[PDB]
Structure formats: C-alpha cells, structure tokens
Amino acid sequence: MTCDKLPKVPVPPLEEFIKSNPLQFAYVLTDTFDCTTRVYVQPARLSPNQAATALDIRGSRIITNDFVGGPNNSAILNNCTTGEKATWYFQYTNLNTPNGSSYCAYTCNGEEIAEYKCANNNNGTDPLQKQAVEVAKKVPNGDKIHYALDNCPEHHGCFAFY
Amino acid sequence: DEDPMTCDKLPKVPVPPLEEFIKSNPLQFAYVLTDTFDCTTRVYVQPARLSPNQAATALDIRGSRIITNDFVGGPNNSAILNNCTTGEKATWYFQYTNLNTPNGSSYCAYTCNGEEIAEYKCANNNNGTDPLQKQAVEVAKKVPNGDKIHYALDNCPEHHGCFAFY
Amino acid sequence: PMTCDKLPKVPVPPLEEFIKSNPLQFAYVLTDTFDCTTRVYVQPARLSPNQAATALDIRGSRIITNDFVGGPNNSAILNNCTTGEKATWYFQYTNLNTPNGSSYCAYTCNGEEIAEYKCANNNNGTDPLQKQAVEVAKKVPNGDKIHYALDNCPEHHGCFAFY
Amino acid sequence: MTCDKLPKVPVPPLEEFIKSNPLQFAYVLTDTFDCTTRVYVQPARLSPNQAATALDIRGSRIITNDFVGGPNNSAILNNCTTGEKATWYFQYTNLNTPNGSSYCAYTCNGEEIAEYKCANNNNGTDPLQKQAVEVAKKVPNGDKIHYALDNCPEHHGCFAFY
Ligand SMILES: [Cl-]
Ligand SMILES: [Cl-]
Ligand SMILES: [Cl-]
Ligand SMILES: [Cl-]
Numbered sequence: 151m152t153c154d155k156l157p158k159v160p161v162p163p164l165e166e167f168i169k170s171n172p173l174q175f176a177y178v179l180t181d182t183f184d185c186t187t188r189v190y191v192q193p194a195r196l197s198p199n200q201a202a203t204a205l206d207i208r209g210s211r212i213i214t215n216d217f218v219g220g221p222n223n224s225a226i227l228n229n230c231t232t233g234e235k236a237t238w239y240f241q242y243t244n245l246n247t248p249n250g251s252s253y254c255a256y257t258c259n260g261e262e263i264a265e266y267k268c269a270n271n272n273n274g275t276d277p278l279q280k281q282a283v284e285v286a287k288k289v290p291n292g293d294k295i296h297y298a299l300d301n302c303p304e305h306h307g308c309f310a311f312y
Numbered sequence: 313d314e315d316p317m318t319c320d321k322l323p324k325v326p327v328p329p330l331e332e333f334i335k336s337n338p339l340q341f342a343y344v345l346t347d348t349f350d351c352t353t354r355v356y357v358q359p360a361r362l363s364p365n366q367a368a369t370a371l372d373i374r375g376s377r378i379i380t381n382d383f384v385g386g387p388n389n390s391a392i393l394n395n396c397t398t399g400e401k402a403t404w405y406f407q408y409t410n411l412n413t414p415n416g417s418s419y420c421a422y423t424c425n426g427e428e429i430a431e432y433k434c435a436n437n438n439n440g441t442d443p444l445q446k447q448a449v450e451v452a453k454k455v456p457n458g459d460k461i462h463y464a465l466d467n468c469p470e471h472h473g474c475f476a477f478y
Numbered sequence: 479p480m481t482c483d484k485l486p487k488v489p490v491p492p493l494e495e496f497i498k499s500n501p502l503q504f505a506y507v508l509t510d511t512f513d514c515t516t517r518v519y520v521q522p523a524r525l526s527p528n529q530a531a532t533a534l535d536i537r538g539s540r541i542i543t544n545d546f547v548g549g550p551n552n553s554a555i556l557n558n559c560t561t562g563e564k565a566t567w568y569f570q571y572t573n574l575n576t577p578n579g580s581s582y583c584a585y586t587c588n589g590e591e592i593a594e595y596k597c598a599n600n601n602n603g604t605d606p607l608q609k610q611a612v613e614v615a616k617k618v619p620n621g622d623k624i625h626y627a628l629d630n631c632p633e634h635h636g637c638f639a640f641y
Numbered sequence: 642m643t644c645d646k647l648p649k650v651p652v653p654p655l656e657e658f659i660k661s662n663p664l665q666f667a668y669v670l671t672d673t674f675d676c677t678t679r680v681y682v683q684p685a686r687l688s689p690n691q692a693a694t695a696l697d698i699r700g701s702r703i704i705t706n707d708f709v710g711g712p713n714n715s716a717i718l719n720n721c722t723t724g725e726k727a728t729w730y731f732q733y734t735n736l737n738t739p740n741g742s743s744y745c746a747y748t749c750n751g752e753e754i755a756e757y758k759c760a761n762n763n764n765g766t767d768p769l770q771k772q773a774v775e776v777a778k779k780v781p782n783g784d785k786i787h788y789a790l791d792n793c794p795e796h797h798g799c800f801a802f803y
Pocket of ligand 2: 421433435
C-alpha cells in the first residue's frame with residue numbers, strides 16, 4: 151500500500167552479494183539506473199569504518215555509495231561524490247539459488263517510493279521478482295517503475311559492461 | 313642479476329586465481345604510465361553467471377568515470393584484455409603478484425608495444441609499503457618508454473565520506 | 479640561487495661545441511630518471527625544415543629524445559619527441575672542450591623550485607665549476623633531491639660509454 | 642652473387658659519418674631496423690680503445706654497437722648489451738654530397754646475408770642506393786630485404802625521432 155509499509159527483509163551478509171556479482175537492474179523507478187550493472191565491493195583493507203560499497207555502472211560512468219547497516223533492517227548509503235545519505239530496505243532477497251540471484255530494494259519519500267532497484271543475474275526469471283515489482287508499482291510514485299534494459303547501448307565484446 | 317632492459321623481457325608470473333584478486337578488492341594504483349590511470353581504484357569482478365566465455369572483468373574507477381576490460385588467460389602467463397567500450401584487445405602480464413599477505417596485497421602489471429612499455433599499473437591496498445613494489449617500479453622504469461611511469465596518487469580529488477571512492 | 483628562477487643563465491654554446499663533447503655522462507641529477515645516463519647531441523636532419531638539434535638521453539636500451547631551440551633569457555626550449563611537451567631549460571654554467579674535457583650543469587624550474595637538474599661531463603667529474611654549481615643548486619627548493627647519479631650502474635659488455 | 646663476394650669499399654673517416662647524422666634506414670633485412678634512425682658518436686674522451694659507437698634508435702628503444710676497423714675494409718661491431726661481435730662491410734658509401742648522404746652496409750652468414758642496412762638523409766634519392774639494393778636482394782637470404790619506412794609511428798613535433 152504505502153512505501154513506509156513495504157517488507158523489510160534482513161540485509162544478507164556481504165559475502166552473499168559478492169557471490170552474486172555482477173547483477174543487472176531489470177526494473178528501476180528513475181531513469182538514472184537504466185542500462186545499469188551493480189557490483190558490490192568489500193571495504194578497503196585500511197578503511198577504519200569498514201563500510202562496503204555499492205557500484206552502479208552505466209557504460210563509462212559510475213555511481214558509488216558506501217553502505218552500513220541501520221535500524222529496522224535498513225542499509226544507510228553515503229553517496230561518495232556528494233555525501234548525500236539515503237535509507238534503503240530490501241523488499242526481498244533471493245541470492246545464490248541454483249537459478250542465480252535476485253533482489254528488489256527501495257528507498258522512500260514518506261509514503262512515496264523515491265527509488266526502486268530490482269537486480270538479478272538470471273535475466274529476470276525469479277518468480278519473487280515479478281510479484282515484488284507488481285506490489286511496488288501500486289505504491290505512490292511506483293507508476294514510474296519500468297523495465298530498465300530496453301534499447302541499451304551496443305556491446306563491444308564484454309558480456310555485462312559496455 | 314641484471315635487470316631486463318626491454319618490456320618483452322620483463323618477468324611474467326602466473327596469473328593468480330581470480331579469488332585472490334577478489335579478496336584484495338579494492339586496490340589503488342600507486343604507479344602508472346599514462347595519466348589515464350591517475351587517482352584510480354581497481355575492483356576485480358567475476359564473470360556474470362550467464363556469461364558464456366566466463367571472462368572476469370577489471371574495473372578501473374576514477375571518480376564518476378570507469379574503464380572496463382574483460383579478461384581471459386592466454387599463453388606465456390598472459391591476460392588478454394578486451395576493452396568493453398572499444399573492443400580493443402591488449403596482452404597483459406604480471407611483473408609480480410603478492411596478494412593477501414599479512415601486510416595486504418600488491419602487484420604490478422604491464423602491457424608492451426614490442427620492446428617498449430605501453431601501460432603499467434602497480435596496485436596495492438597497503439599504501440605502498442610492499443618492498444616488492446618498490447623494486448618492480450625501479451625495474452619497469454628502465455625499459456623503453458618506462459620513464460613515463462610515475463606516482464599516481466598525488467593531488468587527487470577530495471572525498472565525501474567514502475574511503476576508496478570519490 | 480636562493481630560488482630556481484634566480485639561478486645563473488649562461489649563453490647556450492654553439493651546437494658544434496656540444497657535438498665535440500659527445501658523449502657525456504650525468505654525474506649529478508635531481509629525479510631518478512637520468513641516473514646511469516649518457517647524453518649525445520645530434521644536429522638537425524638535413525631535411526628538417528625547423529633545423530632543431532636533438533638531445534639524446536641514453537640509459538641502457540632506453541632513449542629519451544628532445545628536440546631543442548633557443549628561447550628568451552638564454553633558454554633552450556625542449557620538445558619531447560614522444561609527447562610534444564615543452565620544457566624551458568637553462569645552463570647554470572658551461573665549460574665545454576677545455577684541456578681537461580667538458581662539463582656543464584643545466585636545469586628546469588617549477589616556479590621557485592627546481593624540477594630537474596642535469597650535470598654532465600666527460601672527465602669523470604673533476605671540473606671544479608661542477609662541484610660549486612652542485613652546492614648552489616642543492617640549496618634551491620627541491621634541490622635536496624640532487625644526488626650523485628653514477629653509483630651502482632649496470633655492468634658493461636665491452637663498450638666504454640653504453641651498456 | 643653471394644654475400645662473401647659483395648663489394649667492400651673503405652670505411653669513411655668518422656667525421657664524414659658525424660656530418661651525415663642523423664640518417665634513416667630505407668632498406669633493411671630483419672624487422673629489428675624498421676622505422677629506425679642512425680646516429681654516429683665519437684669515442685668518449687676517457688675511452689682507452691677510442692672505439693666509435695653506432696646508435697640505432699627506434700622510437701624509445703636504442704641499440705648500441707661500438708665499432709673499430711678490421712681487415713678487408715671491415716668494421717667490427719661490439720654489441721654494447723650482449724658483447725656479441727659482428728663483421729660488417731660497406732657495399733658503397735656516398736656521404737656528404739650536395740644531395741646529402743647515403744650508404745648500404747651488410748654482414749654475412751657465409752654466403753647468405755645476415756643483416757642489411759641502407760641509410761640516407763635525402764629520402765632515398767641517391768641512384769647508388771637503388772642499384773645497391775637490387776644487387777643485395779639477389780644474394781642468398783636477400784629476398785627478406787624490404788622497404789623499412791612504411792606505416793611508421795606518428796611524430797610529436799620532432800623531425801627524426803618519435
Ligand atoms: Cl540496489
Ligand atoms: Cl592492472
Ligand atoms: Cl642536460
Ligand atoms: Cl648500418
């Protein structure tokens with residue numbers, strides 16, 4: 151019904167995300183994360199805070215966010231370029247099954263969904279992801295959620311980057 | 313005894329298993345040859361589950377920009393890199409690797425243009441303290457075109473709350 | 479001589495005086511780049527329209543090449559043949575083709591600091607001008623890095639000046 | 642014609658070679674000396690043997706050989722890196738004419754030609770060089786002699802180096 155009431159599953163251990171690398175976003179809300187590959191990175195050896203990092207790669211450009219665990223099964227992201235914070239949740243995760251990995255994550259503007267990222271490495275075959283997206287679309291501002299992998303740029307010999 | 317004097321004669325150690333690189337992530341490039349790779353962080357990525365060739369990827373990240381290369385093993389302990397943007401191929405080698413020691417990880421890699429060095433990337437996650445890395449740089453600098461090799465992490469852009477990205 | 483910009487700037491000798499000095503070695507340099515290095519001057523190619531001369535800095539199998547032309551204030555403007563990058567060089571002093579051979583010290587500045595320093599000779603470092611020049615340059619900002627360039631160089635294989 | 646029977650003109654005085662500096666190789670046998678500039682250097686002041694040196698410069702790589710005169714109008718080259726010796730001869734020299742300088746030099750493996758180097762500073766217009774090259778190409782192994790200056794790297798503002 152509203153963004154603040156969506157499911158908030160536990161954040162999997164970082165190792166489960168690393169084992170899923172790289173993932174593609176099948177469904178997103180803004181057009182920022184169209185044609186985008188996600189790679190998770192462990193903290194640098196010398197990092198005192200030991201925050202992990204989410205990489206959102208679109209061609210030759212990249213958006214980076216450190217993240218740490220927060221209350222209520224949240225991930226708090228710190229944009230590495232702007233220092234902007236955002237509180238994210240997982241609607242569900244299904245990492246490293248015999249059919250690969252998927253998850254849907256979101257961040258809210260009160261009752262509205264501000265951003266939505268559904269990732270997978272199996273070309274969108276997980277039944278959980280289909281049901282998750284249909285739920286999110288009925289939340290306020292979820293009408294903007296759209297399939298993200300149409301009319302993306304041509305590749306030049308790499309599978310997941312371009 | 314005597315240092316190799318052309319790029320084609322530099323050492324070529326075995327390419328470590330990808331897992332050793334992933335456990336090193338992320339690394340910084342302390343010394344590079346062209347300015348393209350100044351202020352840069354390396355992240356290695358396993359092949360996509362659905363990739364047929366199962367090529368791993370090297371990410372070279374400089375602020376909001378990235379350079380990506382798929383790679384596979386080749387002859388003579390080479391890694392054959394495929395630039396994901398252009399399709400250009402390059403044969404790389406490791407001068408040495410020293411991954412996942414009790415003092416962290418370093419390596420130096422290179423690619424040649426015949427007897428000259430064309431690019432050089434020395435990475436570490438220990439702020440440059442591995443003695444292997446110091447000696448390797450001294451060696452590489454002395455091959456044709458190696459005088460361009462330089463310390464790459466001076467005067468880099470300020471951060472906004474992340475340790476290894478900006 | 480307190481700062482790089484105020485170092486002496488003697489006239490660039492005619493090219494033939496440099497050619498008669500060939501080859502030279504660098505006794506003292508600032509960066510690591512020109513350790514264990516031999517310098518050879520070359521006239522312009524017959525067909526070169528600009529008739530720039532060329533400085534060759536040779537270290538084993540590696541060569542660094544710079545065309546050069548005269549500039550203002552007794553400068554030599556070097557054009558790196560691989561990149562097209564320009565650098566303004568001066569001579570702190572020259573003493574070419576004496577009865578005890580040839581020496582000079584040359585430098586390039588980054589404002590008040592010295593960016594690179596090259597003292598060349600063919601007499602194994604015995605010109606008294608060179609000792610004094612080095613002492614002066616060493617006190618300019620960044621000149622603390624100036625060091626003797628010919629320790630522990632590679633072994634030769636039958637040639638005197640190249641390896 | 643076999644290599645051992647090619648002409649052997651007198652080695653010109655060093656100063657004639659210095660006056661021709663720099664030269665480029667128009668024709669060579671192995672690919673080592675493609676896209677290459679030759680510079681001759683007098684002996685170092687302190688060199689007891691007083692051997693001159695030939696510099697073969699291909700972009701950022703230099704090959705060095707000291708040389709001294711030998712029997713039969715030979716020049717004996719000493720590779721400064723490996724210590725390997727090789728007996729060279731001049732097929733002809735034509736240094737410092739009003740149309741510039743050319744020469745063709747060679748070294749043999751008995752009856753076969755092991756290496757060939759035709760230098761000039763006039764873009765290949767000396768008639769002596771044309772005839773010399775024709776002769777050498779008919780010697781055993783001389784079929785590998787080729788034009789050396791096609792598709793060479795682009796320059797960055799220097800005429801004879803790159
Ligand atoms: Cl996400
Ligand atoms: Cl690398
Ligand atoms: Cl100099
Ligand atoms: Cl020759």
